[PDB]
Ligand SMILES: C[C@@H]1O[C@@H](O[C@@H]2[C@@H](O[C@H]3O[C@H](CO)[C@H](O)[C@H](O)[C@H]3O)[C@@H](O)[C@@H](CO)O[C@H]2O)[C@@H](O)[C@H](O)[C@@H]1O
């Protein structure tokens with residue numbers, strides 16, 4: 531097998547919750563700074579509280595949901611890894627900001643991972659990053675990353691940090 535970063539693949543589609551649709555889901559940057567062509571790396575609060583920066587990943591704004599879809603048909607994907615959280619670059623100006631209800635990993639229409647099971651009340655700016663390390667079913671065709679904003683999209687700078695597939699075949 532080999533490991534391939536999601537950000538080194540093209541998606542089928544990638545939607546977000548930002549009002550400005552000319553902005554786009556970001557490879558290897560958080561959403562807002564990336565769309566501003568800034569060098570700011572993706573960064574997250576880890577399990578111990580420390581801040582880690584990541585070279586690779588995806589940056590979105592949660593939506594209803596915002597969905598990033600990959601065609602993995604024939605690729606022999608056996609594993610998905612990512613950290614999930616709200617990028618440090620977000621601004622938690624009040625309790626309405628940086629509040630994400632859940633993030634799911636969906637394969638061929640089945641939720642195979644959801645933050646709702648550990649985090650029924652969702653993610654906030656100070657929730658520690660969630661380490662997702664997940665088997666992917668044989669012969670899978672579609673994998674989707676879905677982030678749900680809830681009431682508002684404000685400050686919902688969701689990053690899939692270090693997001694990578696392990697795969698036996700090609701894409
Ligand atoms: C000028 C306008 O600014 C941004 O929209 C804001 C919105 O911004 C926050 O939430 C978005 C996600 O919706 C991003 O995380 C931003 O980085 C945040 O600052 C809020 O502050 C609301 C409050 O009413 O106002 C909007 O104008 C940006 O998203 C838009 O694309 C646009 O650039």
Ligand SMILES: [Ca+2]
Nearest residue numbers: 629679682683
């Ligand atoms: Ca929200």
